[PDB]
């Protein structure tokens, strides 16, 4: 019973806003219409009461048919899933039908938003169905068994990064996917005198010694208003990188944080494809980003990936064209400085904190190449000179600022203020996707 | 290590034409030819501080790029570097990001081959990463480091950052030269440089590698990429009637010719590459499904990119099915679903989702629960005969339109040549 297409669409749509494309084609899916918090959205849920939900010819039809609506009406499209993959009896006709939907999504990839919202079953093509989409909000009772196990969002929030969002309950998946279509579509404009009310000294949320770890998620809370955002995609994945979407003086912004709590904020292969996909997202949807840099470097020692698996994040920033402001609070080193929306990748503006050092090796201590033939093997007795124990008399801002690659130094009380100011001064832009 | 000769040791004997005076930053950028093709190049000076990447150098590679893109010419990099001048600081470090910045404005437009010969750390280990084909010389250890660690044999396995491993530096120059003869000398299909070529091939688990070889020219080499990394999948360029051709085939040997988190990726970029260079393709199916990695996690989100690549694919892409092909993967391996050109087949090749034995499993549910045990395991081998026909029989998926027409084992090359030919070049 509760797996009813209309009962469900009725749960996502604000009640009396619903329409209906295809017949009550009791085939597997229902493709209704209507708005989300006001803004119109083509959708499609699947009937999990009618033959497993396994996607068939007839059922796929309205699905694809619904694409070319939302695609023609440049309105967003959403899919509350619940399918045991393809209908084994239909032969290939279904396989074909299962496969036209894929390409139905792929054509929308960045033209309209494509939230998927999986409530339960999700296998085979329906396991790849929402892969192609843009944001996967998994329902706490949704599983994934496509063997050609165990099931759950708890396994994808971590490990696989497959599921973008775990929901408090299936009903929240309706409530969650409903804001992502608002943020993707009611980003609105900026507001100069609205962050002014919330100019917290953000440097307060920073450790004492630039050596003592912390968690950047709390810092984030400050830059974003109080309502009520994050809405950060798989926190449990790429733990040294906390990406996430959200509003700022009304206007919606992508946020990519380098969380030093885990791995010391250090980037890596698995840490890139989080960002690397998250940037081109807010890029291909005209959403400003913010970069909160505090990363030492990048790495057991899997070279099995890295170089390629880290090139793409540069490619994410270097090809991106949305308004994007960077800021460094402490760290920013080497080929990782470069990789964090720096000027060499065409940043909008780049900001920094009082002790926001910027070097290719660090500073305490990063001299063991310059001072190579000295600070060496006389005793190891008293390593307080040392090398170990330049730094303060360089690195910070001006050491990179007169060079221009950093644009300013700022009072963190009005950290929020600055970005918003810097972000409001670029033009709206949006790109494509592929080659 | 000396840049000049080393650049004269790549170009056509001629031909090298310095796009500046020879300084000491650690870069030498010069124009020239390869089989008569306007080619721009650049090489890091292995001598000067280990080929390090600094400001006035990167600048030159930049101006190489601006000139490659200006003139619509491919762009090669020769790399005996190893990072970015540790004592030029942010300038150098920013000098590199500029080079990416160029290189990033290079994907999908002009060709870009990296032919590493010396060390490579940081930006030097990252330049290659933004260049389409990565050709790694023996001694050329991309000996990259964090904050062996990987030679050419090593960076062809589990990583596979390189594409064509060499066996000597100069030959690697014969690699990278011929390698532009494919992108910028694609050629045009010849209708009769196809005929005297198609064997009755079908007459042969197994190994797929030697099938691809018979599809392409008998003469022209099979420049396979990636091989040892992601092996259950096969990719690599060649020719057909003179027209350059891309090829990707399942690999009955490892992993049961199936898809896996690595597999789909290797094919994935490979396609996006070709549709970004007008080159047409050939896809010889034999995937019997997917596989995790036990990451059942990656393979889903990571499998998607096969769907995309073909979805977003506007170059010709004719498919050949060899025997079995199944589910998402079957759809994945260049199906009509993803706007395919045409699909041909061979007299003994089935298109289904799982197939007999499987195509009766769990469906009949009341089977291994309500049947005589001393026959269940044997009557499990029974439901396959009616199946094979009523399930998976290809004279099904003929009418259904997904496999255009069945082609004879003799008349194979002509076909994979014909359909690619009569097709449009764009859209």
UniProtKB/Swiss-Prot annotation, chain A:
User: Domain CoA carboxyltransferase C-terminal: where?
Assistant: 197-435
Q: What is its EC number?
A: 2.1.3.15, 2.1.3.-
Supply the enzyme class, top level. transferase
Give the matching InterPro entries: AccD/PCCB, AcCoA_carboxyl_beta, ClpP/crotonase-like_dom_sf, COA_CT_C, COA_CT_N
Q: Which SUPFAM superfamilies match?
A: ClpP/crotonase
**Pathway noted in the entry:** Lipid metabolism; fatty acid biosynthesis; Lipid metabolism; mycolic acid biosynthesis
Q: Name one Pfam family in it.
A: Carboxyl_trans
Per the UniProt entry, what is one GO biological process?
A: fatty acid biosynthetic process
Q: Which reaction does it catalyse?
A: N(6)-carboxybiotinyl-L-lysyl-[protein] + acetyl-CoA = N(6)-biotinyl-L-lysyl-[protein] + malonyl-CoA; N(6)-carboxybiotinyl-L-lysyl-[protein] + propanoyl-CoA = methylmalonyl-CoA + N(6)-biotinyl-L-lysyl-[protein]
Q: Does the keyword Lipid metabolism apply?
A: yes
Classify the source by domain of life. Bacteria
Q: Does the keyword Lipid metabolism apply?
A: yes
The GO cellular component terms are:
acetyl-CoA carboxylase complex
| CoA carboxyltransferase N-terminal domain residues | 1-196
Which keywords does the record carry? Fatty acid biosynthesis, Fatty acid metabolism, Lipid biosynthesis, Lipid metabolism, Transferase
PROSITE patterns documented for this protein: COA_CT_CTER, COA_CT_NTER
The job of this chain, per UniProt, is described as:
Component of a biotin-dependent acyl-CoA carboxylase complex. This subunit transfers the CO2 from carboxybiotin to the CoA ester substrate. When associated with the alpha3 subunit AccA3, is involved in the carboxylation of acetyl-CoA and propionyl-CoA.
Q: How does it assemble?
A: The biotin-dependent acyl-CoA carboxylase complex is composed of AccA3, which contains the biotin carboxylase (BC) and biotin carboxyl carrier protein (BCCP) domains, and AccD6, which contains the carboxyl transferase (CT) domain.
Give the UniProt family note.
Belongs to the AccD/PCCB family.
Name assigned to this protein: Biotin-dependent acetyl-/propionyl-coenzyme A carboxylase beta6 subunit
Give the species this sequence originates from: Mycobacterium tuberculosis (strain CDC 1551 / Oshkosh)
Cite the source lineage.
Answer: Bacteria, Bacillati, Actinomycetota, Actinomycetes, Mycobacteriales
